[PDB]
């Protein structure tokens, strides 16, 4: 298996045939882990020699699957839910159970603090529309979403405030200051929100990032999201602005220390000093772990993001 | 000698004492080559053992100077210039003679073509003033000149059109497509224009580049400009906008293939589609070698520069 | 071979079959000369008898290929371009080498002088749009570009000032006043700018010229540009207005004596005597050989072009 963080994953099916030869990096086996099922890519090209794995198998990590050729709280409220009407006791899927356990751990073990803010993105939206036009009449086949600008702004903010690109230990006594900047971006698949991770966001440009995002969003909404494309995230951006919620307080995505939720952009009046100009404010909200970061550092971080997205030219400085 | 392109340079004086110990990278010896006299830096720290070089010596390359411890055209018009008045036959300095020979070679051997253009830099100037304010009230001690934005725009244009980051041979039959992007920026010292080279402009940010430029401009205007800080340039930017010349046609700086001259920014009316808005147009002029580049490629290059400087946000894409 | 100016051209391939019979004037053989590869047309119709030429042959002029049936300057700067980064020493194609040699001869042997000018073409553009509409609803399948009006204006100017329709000798002592008016128009093929020549521009109308131009532009951009369609030019029009460069100084296309570069039309304010009316100015630039023409004659020529294109009705006078 090329890259699983160390969880025992149960196979669902395989992609190959006895005698088939596989391309450079394409699907061979789907395995149903956490978040969503992942398709192992190919390491190289070659015809099949081993069905060392089959349909229904299970691998924890680095197993040869293919050879080729080339205190005392009250209990939950016991209620007879059927005495008031008709019920239907559905049972949560395994990914739903796992996500619930992960969130119930992050809620207890992380002291959350949520700073809300609003970013004037009128210029950013005008520029994004202009670049979506220019990238059309030049036949690039790329769509620049408002999320890649936020990824760049958050990468800049992690460059300036490296305390936010950290992670605590089990006991919460040793920090892990990361020097790389990967950012997960919560994509909405029919099976809930999955977080694919984009690597080295601080270096890549907005068009390369936009191509990566346009690819991986579809890769997730289809279910073919490959492992390693959901591991090693330093930060999370949960954008639900396409649906509403003028603000919301997300949950920190352990083992990270912060998460930026993005809301629906709205045209609001802004005081220019003498009158109310109609600008387009985007409500962001930084929910962070209070053990690593304090209120002032969260304030400086979200105001760095606000300044960067307010005038995107600050990404070249 | 740490880095001379292979020219025999004559020493002027030394910077050290018998027994003195020198710092990491500071002056040891000044040598009067082409363009301007260069101060050899230190390779390391250590007390003096050899005055292997002295005052008045001459080195062509890699000489141990210190050991430490730790067809038929008409002739020129023969005129008796004194029969009309009083004259004074001054003789050109050695750097003036060398620069004249270099320019008289570049004029003959290079077919120049000069494309003029005007760039709407109203937004760029507003943003530069805003960042000069913000970099003051935050005590950065940096001054962001309009030239670093042009360096970034030219680096972007060399990324997009790599044919401009080239160099021809003696016979003009083999090109040398360079992959690095260094840009010389003509600084005006009391001894004329010297071109110091800034390396990897495509990667560095505008504030790092602005610090480099603020340092090396003074380093040149004082004369302490070190070698290697004037070698390996892929492009040249000759900015004379501080003096006038609404346009000018520079001479290609061999062995490069192009040079961008910059003129004085002026507030001109621009057709927005229905009226004349007063914008701030900066006149640029790309003078390039016709043997490598043709008129259409020069047009695309200067319009890439014009688009980048017109909306600097295109540096993040 | 029907028409090569006297250069030894190397064959690339043939267009026919043993037994095939060829039409009136269509492709038989492609030969890779200067500027671009040319397809020899047919002189007549008839079935094949000789493969007197083959694939890879070479002809200098009039060879039977088919029978049918029916002082001391400094050297170039020696730089080790790899000590600053990674390079890639590509070698120029044969057409690039030839064009570089031609331009490096024209630069030395021709004293260039470039007169810039701006032409009010508001009426001309309105009339061209009107005729493009009228030539559509009448099903002519012709597109009238702004370049045919410039060809007509330059033909008129060559009629009025016949000194510009000239050519010098090797020694530059005997002029050759041409009486015909052919005009090359620099078309932009993927292999650079090629100049196809349109004959007797002074007589043909704008719709016939527009059909010729629409045909030969595609003929060049595809590579099927036939010889004789790039020979015998009295003048050159290099139009790069589709790309930018508000002005540019082209290189005289020897053995001609002048060249008109055309830039991007822009809406500028023009003094009507009492106010600034927004007109559409087209920046032209006449670069001419100073040995034949002087500054005043160039001024009169470019002002004739400016007057003609300013009010195109002067083409009937």
Residue numbers in the entry:
A (entry chain C), B (entry chain E), C (entry chain D): 211 to 280, 384 to 630
What does the paper behind this entry write?
The pyruvate dehydrogenase complex (PDHc) links glycolysis to the citric acid cycle by converting pyruvate into acetyl-coenzyme A. PDHc encompasses three enzymatically active subunits, namely pyruvate dehydrogenase, dihydrolipoyl transacetylase, and dihydrolipoyl dehydrogenase. Dihydrolipoyl transacetylase is a multidomain protein comprising a varying number of lipoyl domains, a peripheral subunit-binding domain, and a catalytic domain. It forms the structural core of the complex, provides binding sites for the other enzymes, and shuffles reaction intermediates between the active sites through covalently bound lipoyl domains. In Gram-negative bacteria the E2p catalytic domains are arranged in eight tight trimers further associated into a 24-meric cubic structure with an E2p trimer in each corner of the cube with a 432 symmetry.
We report here the cryo-EM reconstruction of the cubic E2p core of E. coli PDHc in a native resting state (in the absence of substrates), in which a lipoyl domain is bound to the catalytic domain of each E2p and the dihydrolipoyllysine residue is immerged deep in the E2p active site channel (coenzyme A is not present). The overall structure of the E2p shows the expected cubic core, consisting of trimers of the catalytic domains with the associated lipoyl domains, which bind to the catalytic domains in a manner that follows the overall octahedral symmetry of the entire complex. The lipoyl domain interacts with the catalytic domain through a striking electrostatic network. The dihydrolipoyllysine (K245) itself forms predominantly hydrophobic interactions with residues of the channel leading into the catalytic site, which is formed at the interface between two catalytic domains, and both thiol groups are engaged in polar interactions. In our structure the reactive terminal sulfur (S8) of the dihydrolipoamide, which normally carries the acetyl group, is oriented towards a nitrogen atom (NE2) of the catalytic histidine H603′ and is in a close proximity to S551 and D607′.
